Structure 1
Amino acid sequence: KTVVVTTILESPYVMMKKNHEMLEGNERYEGYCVDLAAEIAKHCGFKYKLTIVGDGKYGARDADTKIWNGMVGELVYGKADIAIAPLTITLVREEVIDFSKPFMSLGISIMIKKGTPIESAEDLSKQTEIAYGTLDSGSTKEFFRRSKIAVFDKMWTYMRSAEPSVFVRTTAEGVARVRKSKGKYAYLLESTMNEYIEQRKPCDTMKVGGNLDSKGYGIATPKGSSLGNAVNLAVLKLNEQGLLDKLKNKWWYDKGECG
């Protein structure tokens, strides 16, 4: 029977093709995770349907209702069979779903406008002339809120009290703010997205410094699902064969615009 894949629309992982109206089913979509899903399914021998998570969320547990939202919730409550998406392997998710070993590494990173005199998170933390912030929701904000590391705690105290607000509602708003702020705004985001935007016209942003943390995206299945073992072996095989590196190069650099 057909495996129900839950995923989320986010470039370059999953995108509707420009001509999607002329296409059907899974062929309407393209991107890194679309290609990854096809490779996993081929190695594991299943057919599948790509579905887009209803609530547009990755997966968190509401503190009041204790209900899991997002792709994680679709797995937890038995509505999907597998999630193939930029879904970070975290402790609280690992407690409730199964994850493959990571298919992609990432960490929180600094996006600057080219020419900005910042080389590290330490550099940002010691000044205020260049404002800096994060998405107003989600894991990067939460990283700073929860960190007990001195530099990141300092950054959080700065971010919470800075005026005008250094937070943005969307990735696009953060990128636009970097681009329009003449070097006076830096945006903190996942290194994978930072690298992607560095390859978008007009080629005026860059990733600077080392990453602030390290984590991985994993393929998720309901806890105890028989599919989990085969999927994990497939991730390891695709990595060893160089296919994961090929797919990253395809969607970030071969299709990049900045050389």
Structure 2
Amino acid sequence: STILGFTYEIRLVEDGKYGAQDDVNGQWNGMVRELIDHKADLAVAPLTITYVREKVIDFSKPFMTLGISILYRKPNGTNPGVFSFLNPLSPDIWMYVLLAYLGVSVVLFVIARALSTRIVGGIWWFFTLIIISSYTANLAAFLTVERMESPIDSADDLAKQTKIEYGAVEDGSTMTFFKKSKISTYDKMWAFMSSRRQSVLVKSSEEGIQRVLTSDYALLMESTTIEFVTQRNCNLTQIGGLIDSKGYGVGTPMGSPYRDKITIAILQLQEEGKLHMMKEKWWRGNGCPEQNIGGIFIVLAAGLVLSVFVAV
């Protein structure tokens, strides 16, 4: 407004959607409907320069370039300790074993007061074999499964299942992009969403961030937003590279000549570097600088002392 020679009335779009066509009517919405009807002139906004949006109005040149990427928990998922080692076997069955133990010992307790002992000794030795064998397999089948699947970090990694839900915000160009995808990973990644449209699609970035925190839920985002969003929360992290690449633009109607100094007045300031040092300004990345092994070491450490108090 100081280099174009305009003035400006800030307005939030009513519906609160970025804006993309309706399915069938051919009509747009969000900001996009306004600027096509010309209801407003300026959208100096967090804008996505898609071709459809180029088909209807005109943006500034791509000046804050970006490309879609994933957001996800860190997550610091751990459950070590004694409460882990039970898993390969029923905690109840873990108890019977002691009851199942003293049985033989209390027998020898009375036998002596060596065929008979020995020939039962199998139905202990061979018995516990069943257990330790069973243990191992029950142990393995836990690991292998819980190993072959994860950890995974890529958009294709998401496509490998439905057990990590994902999405974006409605009228998301990103959404649209995945809606408008012909990529047998991303194409597949769409088909997921639009079946569970509601649980996956949120109303804002912020809201959706909680979906990352309310559940195991990655989230699709434009790149520059992402790091900051993590920079402002050390409970999250970013997945994979960039799905694609695009930029932010400045919203005006189609060939409406306001852009013509916007075609100029933007560059110089970042041709200087202000916006980047302004990018620095609002993206000061202040913060977030970018087991079951042991559950029996204690039972190890349990009979150690238990001997010291035996005779002395």
**If the length of structure 1 is used for normalisation, what is the TM-score?**
0.71
Give the corresponding residue for 1:96: 56
Distance 1:146 1:61, change over 3 A: closer
CA distance in 1, matches of 2:207, 2:36: 32
Question: Which has the larger displacement, 45-54 or 105-114?
Answer: 45-54
**Given the alignment, which residue of 210, 214, 217 partners 1:176?**
210
Secondary structure of the 2:259 match is helix
Decide whether the 8 Å contact of 2:48 with 2:173 is kept in 1. no
**Given the alignment, which residue of 225, 228, 249 partners 1:193?**
225
Secondary structure of the 1:112 match is strand
Give the corresponding residue for 1:155: 189
Alignment of 1:1-259 (within 5 A): 41-115=1-75, 117-160=151-194, 165-181=199-215, 184-201=216-233, 203-253=234-284, 256-259=286-289
In structure 2, give the amino acid aligned to 1:175. Answer: I
**If the length of structure 2 is used for normalisation, what is the TM-score?**
0.60
User: What's the CA shift for 1:114?
Assistant: 1.0
| Identical-pair percentage | 53
Distance 1:193 1:57, change over 3 A: same
CA distance in 1, matches of 2:254, 2:175: 28
Answer 1 or 2: which has greater helix percent.
Answer: 2
CA distance in 2, matches of 1:89, 1:98: 9
Distance 1:42 1:109, change over 3 A: same
Decide whether the 8 Å contact of 1:103 with 1:244 is kept in 2. no
Decide whether the 8 Å contact of 2:227 with 2:238 is kept in 1. yes
Question: Which has the larger displacement, 236-245 or 49-58?
Answer: 49-58
Deviations 1:196-248 (A, max 9, x none): 310223x1111121111111111122223232211111122222111221121
Deviations 1:60-102 (A, max 9, x none): 3345554433323322223222211012112222122222111
Answer 1 or 2: which has greater strand percent.
Answer: 1
Gaps spanning 5+ residues in structure 1: where?
A: 1-40
In structure 2, give the amino acid aligned to 1:156. Answer: W
Q: What is the total number of aligned residue pairs between the two structures?
A: 215
User: What's the CA shift for 1:142?
Assistant: 2.2
CA distance in 2, matches of 1:62, 1:193: 26
Deviations 1:22-70 (A, max 9, x none): xxxxxxxxxxxxxxxxxxx222222322222233232333455544333
CA distance in 1, matches of 2:197, 2:38: 44
Gaps spanning 5+ residues in structure 2: where?
A: 77-150, 290-312
